[PDB]
Design an enzyme around this catalytic site. Sequence first.
Site, mmCIF file in Angstrom:
data_model
loop_
_atom_site.group_PDB
_atom_site.id
_atom_site.type_symbol
_atom_site.label_atom_id
_atom_site.label_comp_id
_atom_site.label_asym_id
_atom_site.label_seq_id
_atom_site.Cartn_x
_atom_site.Cartn_y
_atom_site.Cartn_z
ATOM 1 N N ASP A 155 0.852 -1.384 -0.192
ATOM 2 C CA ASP A 155 -0.094 0.149 0.003
ATOM 3 C C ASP A 155 0.754 1.236 -0.012
ATOM 4 O OD1 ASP A 155 -2.337 1.699 -0.163
ATOM 5 O OD2 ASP A 155 -2.916 1.325 1.661
ATOM 6 N N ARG A 159 -0.025 8.917 1.182
ATOM 7 C CA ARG A 159 -0.566 9.086 2.348
ATOM 8 C C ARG A 159 -0.109 7.952 3.547
ATOM 9 N NH1 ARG A 159 -3.512 6.220 -1.606
ATOM 10 N NH2 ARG A 159 -3.532 3.818 -1.339
ATOM 11 N N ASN A 160 0.773 6.962 2.850
ATOM 12 C CA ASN A 160 1.229 6.009 3.771
ATOM 13 C C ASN A 160 2.962 6.297 4.020
ATOM 14 O OD1 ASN A 160 -1.059 4.792 4.333
ATOM 15 N ND2 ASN A 160 -0.941 3.386 2.496
ATOM 16 N N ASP A 173 2.526 4.385 8.712
ATOM 17 C CA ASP A 173 1.257 4.632 8.865
ATOM 18 C C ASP A 173 0.866 4.110 10.042
ATOM 19 O OD1 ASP A 173 0.640 2.277 6.671
ATOM 20 O OD2 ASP A 173 -1.206 2.922 7.772
HETATM 21 O O1 6UF Z 1 1.982 -1.887 8.967
HETATM 22 C C1 6UF Z 1 1.614 -0.602 8.398
HETATM 23 C C2 6UF Z 1 2.585 -0.163 7.369
HETATM 24 N N1 6UF Z 1 3.933 -0.575 7.539
HETATM 25 C C3 6UF Z 1 5.088 -0.125 8.183
HETATM 26 C C4 6UF Z 1 5.026 0.738 9.228
HETATM 27 C C5 6UF Z 1 4.057 1.438 10.081
HETATM 28 C C6 6UF Z 1 4.345 2.352 10.865
HETATM 29 C C7 6UF Z 1 5.731 2.529 10.924
HETATM 30 S S1 6UF Z 1 6.542 1.700 9.939
HETATM 31 C C8 6UF Z 1 6.281 -0.938 7.913
HETATM 32 C C9 6UF Z 1 5.780 -1.918 7.085
HETATM 33 C C10 6UF Z 1 6.741 -2.838 6.247
HETATM 34 C C11 6UF Z 1 6.059 -3.667 5.452
HETATM 35 C C12 6UF Z 1 4.670 -3.618 5.040
HETATM 36 C C13 6UF Z 1 3.881 -2.419 5.841
HETATM 37 C C14 6UF Z 1 4.548 -1.785 6.646
HETATM 38 N N2 6UF Z 1 0.652 -0.117 8.557
HETATM 39 C C15 6UF Z 1 -0.588 -0.495 9.516
HETATM 40 C C16 6UF Z 1 -1.871 -0.802 8.703
HETATM 41 C C17 6UF Z 1 -1.977 -0.915 7.346
HETATM 42 C C18 6UF Z 1 -3.138 -1.427 6.776
HETATM 43 C C19 6UF Z 1 -4.011 -1.582 7.868
HETATM 44 C C20 6UF Z 1 -4.078 -1.439 8.967
HETATM 45 N N3 6UF Z 1 -2.886 -1.147 9.813
#
Ligand code: 6UF
Length: 300
Positions: A155, A159-160, A173
């Site tokens: 994603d 925005r992310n 995010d």
């Molecule tokens: O986990 C993430 C995004 N994310 C992050 C981070 C979130 C904060 C800080 S770093 C690292 C990461 C590495 C691989 C894939 C996604 C990744 N977002 C939360 C979320 C997404 C969708 C629905 C609900 N909750």
Amino acid sequence: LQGHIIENPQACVHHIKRRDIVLKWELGEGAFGKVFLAECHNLLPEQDKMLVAVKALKEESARQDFQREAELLTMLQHQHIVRFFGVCTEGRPLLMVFEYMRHGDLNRFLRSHGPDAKGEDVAPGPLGLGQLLAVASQVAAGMVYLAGLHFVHRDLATRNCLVGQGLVVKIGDFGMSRDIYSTDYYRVGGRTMLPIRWMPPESILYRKFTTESDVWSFGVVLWEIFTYGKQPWYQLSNTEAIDCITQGRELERPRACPPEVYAIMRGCWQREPQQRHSIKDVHARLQALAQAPPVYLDVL
Ligand SMILES: O=C(Cn1c(-c2cccs2)cc2ccccc21)NCc1ccccn1
């Protein structure tokens, strides 16, 4: 869900006492929980008292998923990935503590510093070429890091990404994107929301997600940057965008975008995933332009 770290098949989790966290006010709320601004005491040696973003999860499977999420977030340590500080497991709700990013999400930051807008880290008026490249290079550095650890985002979009003091840009995010930016997702079955405008044809048609589908999304992120946060294919409905993407159409070159930067975008958009340039190469090219002297950038 698409964009959640737990979709990766990839403890050392740091814990924080509830007393050390002092909630200030809510920053947002989504389907997965609420996000607050808080003061966190005794977290960083010099700090003593520091601001943090606190995600309070809604809640079993939830407590199991929470632990897997914190383990995966603990694995990430990079200058361009939003810092995860640890969890609070004493009492309810379960909390996740992150660094606070003063300027909010990168989409909001681009729009507020673009030709359609109404001065500490940024000059007045639209962001210059050099600022746009610095933003692009930092997102690319974060994507190089994740690819190096064999993580797939799914994603990736402005925005992310978050913006902190000193124009520092990081990927991360707090899971509220579907609630804040619902028009950036196509709802399939009352619950599943897909960021189709950021997805390559293999993800739309075959539901395949890789480092190469992320590089395609990075190309779309590059386009969002050079258009000051405009929605890709904004002139098309959700079905028309699916048609364009699957039919092989490519987004037009943004006016603020030099030919050299558009070639980087097109390199991310090759139909065949194998033919797409590596994120490592995309990063080296953007970093080089970002740190180019004004004499060189002026003629670009
Ligand atoms: O986990 C993430 C995004 N994310 C992050 C981070 C979130 C904060 C800080 S770093 C690292 C990461 C590495 C691989 C894939 C996604 C990744 N977002 C939360 C979320 C997404 C969708 C629905 C609900 N909750």
